[PDB]
Design a protein around this ligand. Sequence first.
Ligand SMILES: Nc1ncnc2c1ncn2[C@@H]1O[C@H](COP(=O)(O)OP(=O)(O)OP(O)(O)=S)[C@@H](O)[C@H]1O
Ligand SMILES: Nc1ncnc2c1ncn2[C@@H]1O[C@H](COP(=O)(O)OP(=O)(O)OP(O)(O)=S)[C@@H](O)[C@H]1O
Ligand SMILES: [Mg+2]
Ligand SMILES: [Mg+2]
Lengths: 272, 199, 630, 99, 51
Amino acid sequence: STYIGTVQDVNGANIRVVLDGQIGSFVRIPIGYINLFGIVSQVGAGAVPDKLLEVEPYGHRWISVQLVGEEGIKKEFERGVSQYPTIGDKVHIVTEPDLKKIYGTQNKKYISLGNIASVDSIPALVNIDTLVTRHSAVLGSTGSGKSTTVTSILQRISDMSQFPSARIIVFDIHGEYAAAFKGKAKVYKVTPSNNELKLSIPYWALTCDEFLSVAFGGLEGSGRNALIDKIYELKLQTLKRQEYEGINEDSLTVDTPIPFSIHKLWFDLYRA
Amino acid sequence: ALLETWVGSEESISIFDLSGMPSSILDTLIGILIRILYDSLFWSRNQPEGGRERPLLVVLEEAHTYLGKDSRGIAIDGVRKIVKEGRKYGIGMMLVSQRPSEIDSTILSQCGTLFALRMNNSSDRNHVLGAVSDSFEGLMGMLPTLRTGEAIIIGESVRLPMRTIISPPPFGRRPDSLDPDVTAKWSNNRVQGDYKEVL
Amino acid sequence: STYIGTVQDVNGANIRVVLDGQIGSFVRIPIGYINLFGIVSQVGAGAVPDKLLEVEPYGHRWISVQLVGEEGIKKEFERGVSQYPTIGDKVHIVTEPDLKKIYGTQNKKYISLGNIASVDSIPALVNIDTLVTRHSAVLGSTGSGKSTTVTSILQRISDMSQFPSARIIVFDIHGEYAAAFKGKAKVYKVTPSNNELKLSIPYWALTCDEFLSVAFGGLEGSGRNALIDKIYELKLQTLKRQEYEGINEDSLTVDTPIPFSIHKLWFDLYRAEISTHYVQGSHSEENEASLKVVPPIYMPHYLSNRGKNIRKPLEGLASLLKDPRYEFLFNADDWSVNLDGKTNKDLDALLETWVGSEESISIFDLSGMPSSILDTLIGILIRILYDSLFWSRNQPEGGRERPLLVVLEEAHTYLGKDSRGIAIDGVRKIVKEGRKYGIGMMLVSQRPSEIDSTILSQCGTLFALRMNNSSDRNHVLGAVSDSFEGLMGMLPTLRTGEAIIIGESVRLPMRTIISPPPFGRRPDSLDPDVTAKWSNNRVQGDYKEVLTLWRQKKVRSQRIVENIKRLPVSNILSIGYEADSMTLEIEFNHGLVYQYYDVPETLHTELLAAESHGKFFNSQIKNNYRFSRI
Amino acid sequence: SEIDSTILSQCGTLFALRMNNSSDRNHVLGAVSDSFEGLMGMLPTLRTGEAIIIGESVRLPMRTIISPPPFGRRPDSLDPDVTAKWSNNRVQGDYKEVL
Amino acid sequence: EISLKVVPPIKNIRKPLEGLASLLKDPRYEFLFNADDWSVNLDGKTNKDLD
Ligand SMILES: Nc1ncnc2c1ncn2[C@@H]1O[C@H](COP(=O)(O)OP(=O)(O)OP(O)(O)=S)[C@@H](O)[C@H]1O
Ligand SMILES: Nc1ncnc2c1ncn2[C@@H]1O[C@H](COP(=O)(O)OP(=O)(O)OP(O)(O)=S)[C@@H](O)[C@H]1O
Ligand SMILES: [Mg+2]
Ligand SMILES: [Mg+2]
């Protein structure tokens, strides 16, 4: 069989089992008909109770374990605890079928993005409905391999067998992803290439503030009150000289993505 | 047609390469693209093209420079609105950065799930521990000693936190930046110089 | 008789027991004639005394004696004990009848919500006056009960057979509670639905300071004093034209709720800022050379001498009146104010509708609110409710004779320790001066640490769902009136739904399993489903429309059909059709109604004769036509 | 626990009643030199009305049961009653005056 | 710097002055500015003495 030890303490959730057990490995605790799964926290002198070493200063065989969830009556793994364990109970190791049970899921919203540390055959199912709706963030050191873990995920999301209608945008500042997606993406950049289109961001698709923030460096006096007057005038004429549905002489604002000629702005404003 | 290329192409993923940008304005553009992608999806949440029928996902590299705790840029304003109202219109987001402690703490906490790769300096680890909710005491004292690509995922996107090992992309599909190779570019015999053209 | 162990040694407080038992479970100790019920969180390995460990260190069966309350003289259970245990006495497990008496009561004051963990048959009796007069809070992790719990309490308190005059209000930023209350609640949202009203907050019912905090960003100059001067004349002028009872020119104030036309404000203020002056130095309007926002053209220009440095807010304000996203505040539908400042109705209907509806609950879903000014409006709504019941506390409709219960969802973003918003400046008052007017409060937040401590100190009782992180457990435990060590140690492992109630609204802190509401009556949020939306095949998009709407700031395509009739039948409820324009309208559960276009009506007949709906609708309609959902 | 300890010490005699939370039971102990286990070990199980007196104004400290005052002379705040005012049948109101 | 007064209508501590005026008009503070017997007239005499 597989035996670790016995529970020699209880505090509701925090438990301190004594052996006769890896730092991250789970622990299984049957109680009659349902089992409690737990997480190790520390090892050695960190798990010893406050008042034991006085008589046995060098008795170090203690481990601290924590409780995460509980398995129902052949139904599923439900978080929490139906009935907490007590002193002098049994303990068992988490074996291969159990890992499937705890981590398994029959729902179809989950997708496999990796393998757990202990057993390599376990898919690392992570919800995608949640990963795209709540939010996500990748953090780490510099050489820890972020962009490689942002492609091994961002490449499994847009698969063409399950998600033929996916949709994604990327912002790479060093240009290190275009090499990964050879025939799966539409790479954009400033310098054209043979099969890469050239990023183009029309200057008239911008609000008044943002255009004033990239072009004129930020004006605050009457200059800011003169440029706005001109842009409005230009977007007035383009409406008279060409037809755009819906936009009228009143619904038109300074910040509607309507085309205006920047060169005419500088030339006419500067020439005057 | 412009939008059709960014979002409506026949290939799913778009990739915007900004390494050529004049970096004095690199921040404002990140706040320009997010605004256009957000308004276009937000204002057409009925039609079959909006974010309610094809949910979006914006991934941002090196987010610690534009999401500073006291940054005065325009990107942080955009990254806050999508962090706040995106759940209604299905516009998620992914954040990448190697300096967590420089990220604003009011934006880093509103991210449901976190990938926790290696972290050594204690000004970050003590700051990541300040935003993750289901924080175990056995799997979060393990941050600085992970392997490369041995991420830890904690949040509600998983039933419970897991210490996964992401599968690397197939060889030849990896991300590779193209920087000049000094050892291979300095070691060759000197060639006759023609500096007339350089002027 | 369940014998386990007996006492054999004494160490002052540690009373040592040799054995021959759940953690948060009571123990019974009879002493002659009076029974002692209480908690002993120290037993076994965690209780063996340090003095004796030298003898037997490898054994753990030892208990201690410290109680909570004593059984009276066959009367009832009260906290405290007349006498403390002694030598020789033995501890017995509690029995179901004892649970009935300890948690039972003969008072009709209490109400039942959930059940005790041990035996489900027991009811979970919770006071109501203290649950509405002493305020309270709800706390726990993100995935625990949380909202599924708040609805059950409001769905039990607001029963008509037992409380036929209840009165409460709910703030739900995600708008996830309107689903549970199918037709028993009012629900106001910015963009209406088939049978829902408009959450219109008339701007003329705001204090001047709050008005300048939503429309001008906090002007802090001489111009700020120009607006106050300008608004006063409008508010003063409307009084002289229309008589109002009890206020005249003398006792008029800048902050009293008299309607005024903002359109006149911006137009007169904006026009008197820039215009040609026929005669130099003349500020008269006769020297210059309205239902719609259209301004008349002005000739080129000297400039008016009556102006200031408020050009940016004044032009920025004009924009706030254009976009439809703020239509609720500035274009209150039935409270829209014409140019002369005379609207159709007054706040009577607003108050009569918010709190005076024939049905008990009212709901304000704020998902449609722009998150920039979400905090500012939260404070505004609180002020209106408190003040209205303040100066009318003797009347027969106020809060004294019909107390209120304002519920706030997701509060941790609004009561921050360093938060400088107006919400906390409004929430503090009710927690302080709301006791003697009967204005309650229920706080919800998934992360208590950020909540201001003084606010969390003054709440009467606390609901404690599961809480994972250690940083927050320590903060919430620091504002507990009556805490148990055996009960609060299992806070990070509570299963979903069941909560722990602590405070003055119950006799004892108890671990209750709140009854889940009926299936189909739950708080559900209808957010887009990626897995069901990304998996379907591609569809050639027509972006020429997406651009057009994005330009027009509209949300409905110009090809919609409005006057179609429907006939009742995954769970398809109603199906429409129209051969004139080849439009097929369908309706599903949760009120979702689409409009598929250019579909042959042969399928319409086939579906009616298909008698196989659900499994057959996806056969030839799921992704085969262009639909403009509504 | 929140009160300033600077002003607490100068007080001569202190009456202490039922104290449940462990956080505050420690602070009160710090303002009394007579650290007696029996006096304060029984603090968290004191019945309503009970008290323990410590200070110079009392010759010897011990627990006493204060006799409650007679009915008709008893503190009670006249806060509105929720269940009594919600239980009564709903009555049509007129907000023309409340406004 | 410039009805109950006979005159017909025509330092940076102004906003205190308006805030000061709020207390005067409010009936809820009349216990302090408008004491039942202790209000001070322009002549300066009070109907009673603090003794
Ligand atoms: N998922 C992975 N699995 C195995 N090795 C990886 C993985 N990701 C990155 N690496 C390894 O790291 C090297 C790839 O280049 P790196 O610079 O180390 O990664 P990187 O993602 O480009 O770094 P950053 O700063 O996080 S973008 C190789 O030695 C990889 O084997
Ligand atoms: N008593 C219960 N028994 C079984 N399942 C429950 C119970 N209560 C809640 N749940 C389930 O757990 C889910 C958790 O979702 P919610 O109850 O809405 O919690 P929540 O996400 O914190 O609420 P907010 O206010 O939107 S953060 C629920 O949708 C249920 O499926
Ligand atoms: Mg990198
Ligand atoms: Mg909820």
